[model samples]
Target chain A: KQEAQETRQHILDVALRLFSQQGVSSTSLGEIAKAAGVTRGAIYWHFKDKSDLFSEIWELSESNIGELELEYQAKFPGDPLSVLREILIHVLESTVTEERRRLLMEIIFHKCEFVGEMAVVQQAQRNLCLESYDRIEQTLKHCIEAKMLPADLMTRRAAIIMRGYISGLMENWLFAPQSFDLKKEARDYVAILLEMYLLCPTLRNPA
Target chain B: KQEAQETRQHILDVALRLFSQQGVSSTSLGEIAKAAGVTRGAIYWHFKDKSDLFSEIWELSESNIGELELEYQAKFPGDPLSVLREILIHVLESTVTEERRRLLMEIIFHKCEFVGEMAVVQQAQRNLCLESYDRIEQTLKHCIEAKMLPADLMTRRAAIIMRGYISGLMENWLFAPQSFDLKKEARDYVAILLEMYLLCPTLRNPA
Candidate 1:
């Protein structure tokens, strides 16, 4: 059972690299098995098919804001927005410091095509995005309650905009790291987004 | 020559459909040719390799901004900012009205993975982005000169944010079209971006 679990993990490591290097659509189960030094039967024992393996590879890149907030709460200790800002900045900056995340970001953003059975992966990604949005919105709702944000400020819309900015900043910057200083500018980038929520009436309308 | 040209174009049509539905990495030249009722040799005659065919398929999607300006100039003859706003609104609205564009947007954003030989495609995309940045900055430069924008307005930074916002809006909205009303909300979306230029100091630093 332990060997079986370790082989499953080994196959995962091979799949992501191949998926990132060549592409998910072009990379095959047989090839993955070969790269993992395991028989094709070994992969079948561990997962259903390429899509399942691919989905698991995506699942490997998990978001744990639930776990992170307590860790951040220890830092900010009081302010909701400050905690939120720290988290956003950490999320953005991690793309630089966190090797696995940066590779996973590139793989997800640029190296995987979502179609056919990959629809499952797309849905899972959407659920993750929605969950992140809710987490941000919940944090933002607190900011409003604590009188840090305008009472009329729409938390959901604010969360959506933050995501839009954060994703684009990551997607574009990762694609062309030479174009800008993501780590240096991440603080200002996050600040601009929070400020947009402060000034833009587009996000102030009641939902 | 004319008949051959038409067959080449017919292949382009099939290629895009297959590429969008299955993904570029999975869609082979033989499959594209088969779907188009052509032969494997026929694709080779038209294109050097799968990579070349893929690149050409992408090139089929063109941006003729120089041509569009004269057309848009007719709409807003005097004001640069208004013309810029109109152009941005037109772009966002096109993703909804333009069927081929919507499909291509799906293909580019979700259906095609950039890796290995797709390095050419990535470079081309980066070039297009840079060109667009320059064009927007030029338009914004005129706005600053016309006293429509602040003297300290960083047109380059403003362009980056606008592109970031525009892309995320397109990518996210295309992935989940139900999220918001892109077509109806196009006007306000453009307005909010322009207002950000007016309001956000982050986009105003000397670049």
Candidate 2:
């Protein structure tokens, strides 16, 4: 059993390297098995196919989305704006500083081609996005009720804008790390987003 | 010469379809030739390799940043804010309704894997982004000079925010287009961005 676990991990590590270096579509199970010193049959035994293997590798770098949601509840119970800002700042900082996390994001944003068998991966990302948007919208609702945000603020628009802002920062930063200092300026960026959400007149409900 | 032009367009069309369907890494010159009813030699005569071919297709769908810059100068000469809003609104509208434009965006944002030979494509995209930011910054300077936007607005930060917001909208909208009505909300969305630029305190230059 222990040996099986080690082989599975070895296969995943080799796949990650190959995927990062080449890409998901170009990297084949055969190459991964050869690099990992495992048999093709062993890879099949461990993973159903390339899609399955790709999904597993993604799982390795999964950010604790659920834990983050709960942490907002416990760490900052009443101030939803603070909670929202804190989580976004955490996302940017972790994405910039953590090797595995940044690599995973790089794979998702650049190295992975979401066509053919990879359609499932795209759907998974869409679902993840929807889930995150829902959580942010919920928090925005709390902020509105707490009088920290304007009651007329359209929470849905606010949520989508914030998601775009945060993801854009990460995606662009990953594309060109030198363009801006995400590590040093993440808080200021988040502060700018929050300020826009609170003050942007076009984000308010039109009477 | 006419035959050569027709063949070139045919090749690009087939490549766009295949790249959109299967992604750049998975789509091959052979497949493109087969689909376009051309010989491998014909493709070689036009493009050096897959990277060259992919880059050509992308050029076909560029956002015409240069032309837009000139148009803004003539069409909204004294009002850079109007010029900026018009260009952004045009971007959102076309991205929502134009099939080829939208397909090219999807290929860039999702279908293309930017590893190995495709690193050139990534660099091209970064250059284009920087070019767009510079133009937007130039326009924002005009707006400040005309007193259309706040004189104290940090135009550099404003440009980045606007770029991020615009591209973020495109990226997210393309990810799950059915999630929202970009077609209906494009104007409102651009208005929100402009409002944020004009009002957000963090985006303002401190006195």
Candidate 3:
């Protein structure tokens, strides 16, 4: 059992590296097997197909969405704005802070093609985005009740804007990490997003 | 000569569609030839390889960033704030109003994987992003000079956030378009960004 587990983990490391160096579509199972020193028979024994292999690697619930989703439950309690800010800051910083995460973000954002055999991947991303948006909107509602934001806030659009900004920060930073310092600048980015709640008239519920 | 150009344009359109449906790495020159009903020799006459073929299709100047950078000059020269707003609004609304644009964006954001043989695509995207940021920064300076923006505003950070927010909105909207009203509410997104220049403390020039 130990031998099988070690072999399975090795297969993923090699698959991820190839996918990072090339892309998921161009990287084949045989190439991955060769790189990992495993056989096709063994790969299929553990994974149903290439998509199945990739599905296990993209653990959004833990890396990006999962941690943020967990934040909604009162890690800070009472102060939804603080909780929301933590979620925002965490998304930007984690890419800089984590290990497998940086590669996974690159794989999902740049190295993975969203069609044909890997089409299930796109649907999974959409599902995570939907849940993330819902949590942000719910937090915004709490912010309004806490008097941290105006009562007339349009929580839905505001939530979408927040998610878009956070993801956008990650997307650009991932594309060009040296272009900016995400670790140092995350709070500033989140601060600007927070001010939008009060200054932007359009974010208020239309009377 | 006319026949040659016809084949060339047809090659681009098909390559574009396939790239949108599949991606750059997954689709090949042979696949393109069959779909376009042209010979490999014909494709060679126009593009050096698959990378060359896609580089031509993604003419950044004509679409997303180009038209917006063009906003920098006399389109609304005196009021740089208006130009910035127009630039922001254009980025979001174009994906909806412009039909071919939607596909181009989808291809860039999702369909094309940025690694291996086609890794140059990511570099090309980076150049466009660099130039785009320069133009937005120029416009923001114009905004401050005209007293439309606070002198304390950090134009560099503000510019990065602006591009990040605009592109973020596009990325999210493109991914789950049916979930929101990007068509009607793009202006709201733009307005909120504009307000950040005045309201966000961190966007201010640091002492």
- Lowest-lDDT window of 10 residues in candidate 3 chain A? A60-69
TM-score of each: 0.91, 0.93, 0.90
> Candidate 2 regions off by >4 Å?
A1-7, A60-62, A72-77, B62-69, B72-75
For every prediction, compared with the true complex, DockQ reads 0.66, 0.79, 0.77
In model 1, where do residues sit more than 4 Å from their true spots? A1-8, B1-6, B64-66
Using lDDT, give the best candidate's number: 2
Model 2 docking tier (incorrect/acceptable/medium/high)? medium
Q: TM-score of the candidate numbered 2?
A: 0.93
Q: Per-residue lDDT of B47-121 in model 3, one digit per residue for the tens?
A: 787776677887722565455455464777667688777766776887898867788788878888877567776
On DockQ, the leading prediction is 2
> How many backbone collisions does model 2 have?
0
Residues B71-154 of candidate 2 have per-residue lDDT tens digits of 676966677788788888888888877777778788888888898689987788789778867777877887888888887888
Error of 1 at A105 (Å): 1.1
Ranking by TM-score: 2, 1, 3
